[PDB]
Amino acid sequence: DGRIFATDALEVAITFVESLDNRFMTSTASRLSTVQREIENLETRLNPNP
Amino acid sequence: MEENTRQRTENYISAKNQHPAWILLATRRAPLVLSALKTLFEKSHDGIPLEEAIQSLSSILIEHVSQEQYDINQDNPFLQASRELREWIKRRLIVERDGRIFATDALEVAITFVESLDNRFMTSTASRLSTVQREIENLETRLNPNPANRVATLRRRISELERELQEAEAGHIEVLETHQAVEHIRDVYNLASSLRADFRRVEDSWREADRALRQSIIGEQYHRGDIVERLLNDQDALLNTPEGRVFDSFQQQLRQSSELKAMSERLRVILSHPSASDALNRLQRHDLRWLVKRLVDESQTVLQARARSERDVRGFMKTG
Amino acid sequence: NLEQSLLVAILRQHFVAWEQESGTGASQAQIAIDDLLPQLQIYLGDPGSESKERTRLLTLLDQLKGHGLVTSPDAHERIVIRPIIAHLADPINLQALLAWLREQIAQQT
Numbered sequence: 139d140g141r142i143f144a145t146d147a148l149e150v151a152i153t154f155v156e157s158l159d160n161r162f163m164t165s166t167a168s169r170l171s172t173v174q175r176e177i178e179n180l181e182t183r184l185n186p187n188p
Numbered sequence: 189m190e191e192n193t194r195q196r197t198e199n200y201i202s203a204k205n206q207h208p209a210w211i212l213l214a215t216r217r218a219p220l221v222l223s224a225l226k227t228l229f230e231k232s233h234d235g236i237p238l239e240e241a242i243q244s245l246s247s248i249l250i251e252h253v254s255q256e257q258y259d260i261n262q263d264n265p266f267l268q269a270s271r272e273l274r275e276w277i278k279r280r281l282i283v284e285r286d287g288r289i290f291a292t293d294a295l296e297v298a299i300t301f302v303e304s305l306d307n308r309f310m311t312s313t314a315s316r317l318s319t320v321q322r323e324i325e326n327l328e329t330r331l332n333p334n335p336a337n338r339v340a341t342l343r344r345r346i347s348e349l350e351r352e353l354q355e356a357e358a359g360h361i362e363v364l365e366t367h368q369a370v371e372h373i374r375d376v377y378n379l380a381s382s383l384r385a386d387f388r389r390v391e392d393s394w395r396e397a398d399r400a401l402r403q404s405i406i407g408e409q410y411h412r413g414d415i416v417e418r419l420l421n422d423q424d425a426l427l428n429t430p431e432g433r434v435f436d437s438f439q440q441q442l443r444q445s446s447e448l449k450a451m452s453e454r455l456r457v458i459l460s461h462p463s464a465s466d467a468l469n470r471l472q473r474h475d476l477r478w479l480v481k482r483l484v485d486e487s488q489t490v491l492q493a494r495a496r497s498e499r500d501v502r503g504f505m506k507t508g
Numbered sequence: 509n510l511e512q513s514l515l516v517a518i519l520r521q522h523f524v525a526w527e528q529e530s531g532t533g534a535s536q537a538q539i540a541i542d543d544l545l546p547q548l549q550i551y552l553g554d555p556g557s558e559s560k561e562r563t564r565l566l567t568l569l570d571q572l573k574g575h576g577l578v579t580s581p582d583a584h585e586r587i588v589i590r591p592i593i594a595h596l597a598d599p600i601n602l603q604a605l606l607a608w609l610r611e612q613i614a615q616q617t
Contacts, residue, residue: 183369
């Protein structure tokens, strides 16, 4: 419709070079809390024993 | 703001010409190197011991000796493996430490890129949205100090959990149907695997900060009394930076053995569920099974690596 | 030429589709330009730019109007298929072209 867009390929390429920057890591205590809560919730949902 | 764009092209040219990962991606022989390294490091828990590295990389080279268009060797795959290993070490693509070689941050980024490139099982699962919703709930409910807001949030939470308790006691509990459960398992694995993502960034930050300190120490006339405090202030400054701050906060959080005990006991049952084999193959299943041990061991390794910087003060202050 | 012939085939298919409902009436055989783009996109690829493929299609339609098979686009981006197409794409012509094309594909193999 006469409007250019960024394809998926360019999105991957941009995300790549971007991840060479200074930033916050994903190895953060908050990530640990997230995965811990997630294990808790997922286990509790999985085991069927009432 | 776009004044920085002039500076950003310079930044990207610098990254292109220096950052090992991008240079690797640009090479003619890139896919071979990346596939070989991915295969090699898929089975690493610590830095793979050097001898094992040479042997297994020779076997991997043997796997692909058929590709003669890549100038692959045909007289001694062991010598070829050793030569390639030292070549890659020269490329700042893998580093020796205690005789056990590790994967630098560059390789991790390149591998993550290429892996995410192809059609596959995608990064997000159907459970990613629910995970984000729960996390947003907690973050908002904790960010605001308005005590009325917090007590109201807890009141609605407790009423909802009372509803759920009544429902479960009456016997209408509900569980994940198979294909929901598999998606949750995969999302859990993907979240967990991100913890390893930056044990190598932290060590490089330590290394560069220590190198900068020693280099600036060339002006020896500065007061060693300043460094009696700089011993802690190096960690403090990197605690103004995300690296030291978040890594030490992660260490403190991980030291809570009770929550880690809960997490391990829960990982065991989640993996014992039948759909675990559906969500994750053998390799992934084992990897997640003792993730906790992986984190503990590798964080201990990072600490004992920063121990050299801890000794840097004794290499600076003493001039006997 | 055979891209023009492909466009002729699609036009004839639309023409017969309309003639089924309208009988052999006056030439109300009209098709929106937008309806052609999906059809041609299958054979002539997807250059990923709707404007580019529109230019391609309009060049083809100009060439065909040179042969009198279609009127040039009107205000609403619509064209009228001149009934002459039924005689340039009648069964005997179609079955000659089909044999020739099968022969061409055999040579390609």
